[PDB]
Amino acid sequence: PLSDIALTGIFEISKILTSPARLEITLANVVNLLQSFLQMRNGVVSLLADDGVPDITVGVGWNEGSDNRYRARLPQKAIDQIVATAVPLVADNVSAHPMFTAADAMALGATDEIRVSFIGVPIRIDSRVVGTLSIDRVRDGRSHFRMDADVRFLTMVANLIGQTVKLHRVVARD
Amino acid sequence: PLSDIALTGIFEISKILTSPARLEITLANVVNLLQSFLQMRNGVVSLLADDGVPDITVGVGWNEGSDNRYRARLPQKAIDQIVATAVPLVADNVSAHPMFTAADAMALGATDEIRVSFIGVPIRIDSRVVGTLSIDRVRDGRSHFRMDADVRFLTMVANLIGQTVKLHRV
Fold first, then answer.
1. What residues of A are in contact with residue B152 (Cβ under 8 Å)?
2. Number of domains chain B is built from
3. Domain range holding A74?
4. Strand, helix or coil at B21?
5. What does the protein in this record do (chain B) (predicted)?
6. How far apart are CA B29 and CA A21, in angstroms?
7. I want to staple A133 with a disulfide (CB 3.0 to 4.6 A). Which of A53, A90, A158, B28 is the partner?
8. Residue A86 sits at the chain B interface (C-beta within 8 Å)
């Protein structure tokens, strides 16, 4: 059952967020889990300073100082929309979508032959949007992953990540 | 269908935990949801200060100042066990569980006819148990499978509560 696997995934994610470790290590383990467990590929936690300048960017396999490698994979128009609107964004086919340039689709693995869907949700801290959590899926003869379920699940993960981020920011700032 | 309901519950719990509010208001909304939505009844959050102080106790239907009434319901020895052990305590039958006095069992509603199950779970912050999350009910014949699933669910909720509590304390 997809719900059984998703219940185990959020159970494991809850453990990860409570384990004391460097924020980037926590966020890395989370998106690693979204991929290996729920087949959500290229999961990226993008965090921004208050002036919209990148703070940290971490995706699957993050090592120290690799932030740019993951930021070079984000479709900035779509991410800008999510940040500016505080509403999730979905594209069934990023190769044929207004908010995705030719470069956006290439970076996300999309071609004229391979249909790639994008799903991004906002990360919020006290009504302010501080970043994005985004994934993509390749539409082949995989399971029938409903985009609305992904949006719900990622919105839940984003909420918890925002608390983890506020925790780290409150700590460092004192 | 079991996991769908739980998924919705943890989804809603996540929004409650991340909505700005009084700490006590947050914890009361969580246990209110656990009871009304997931039928995990009589939920109590008890947080210890570093000297072991009770410091905050909030259960279903909490009103300002009512902490001591919820703590009166909790079997302190079992709480002592969970804190030192960082492991769930499942008291399938509190009248026969060795960590429960007769007074502890009766306070949970146990009688010579009625019987009561108790499940307690550690709330950890930085490898240290700062409190417990517990539920209780009239005993039923749940499968060991769903008993474990309920324990897994409350462990998850307690993990997230700990993150919320640490945030409030800093």
1. 11
2. 1
3. 2-173
4. coil
5. Required for activation of most nif operons, which are directly involved in nitrogen fixation.
6. 29
7. A158
8. no
Q: Provide the edge-to-edge strand list for the sheet that holds B44-47.
A: B56-59, B44-47, B129-138, B116-124, B89-91
Q: For the residues of A14-83, what is the DSSP string, one character each?
A: HHHHHS-S-HHHHHHHHHHHHHHTT--EEEEEEEE-TTS-EEEEEETT--TT-HHHHHTTS-HHHHHHHH
Whole-number Cα distances in Å, B6 to A97, A163, B33, B40, B150 = 35, 21, 11, 11, 10
Instruction: Tally A–B CB contacts below 8 A.
Output: 70
CA A103 to chain CA mean position, Å: 19
Contact A156 B14 (CB under 8 A): yes
For residue B123, what is the DSSP state?
A: E
- From CA A58, how far away is CA A47, in angstroms rounded? 9
When CB atoms are compared, the residue of A156, A166, A170 closest to B11 is A156
What would the two tokens of residue A47 be?
A: 């965090």
Rounded CA-CA distance B103/B50 in Å is 27
Cross-chain residue pair A167–B163, CB shorter than 8 Å:
yes
- Is A30 within 8 Å of A13 (Cβ atoms)? yes
Helical segments of chain B, H only: 2-17, 23-36, 67-71, 76-85, 102-107, 144-169
Documented resolution in Å: 2.3
Contact predicate B120/B133, CB 8 Å: yes
The verdict on B143 touching A (C-beta cutoff 8 Å) is no
Instruction: Tell me how far CA of residue B19 lies from CA of A68, B5, B15, in angstroms.
Output: 31, 21, 6
Q: Technique behind this structure?
A: X-ray
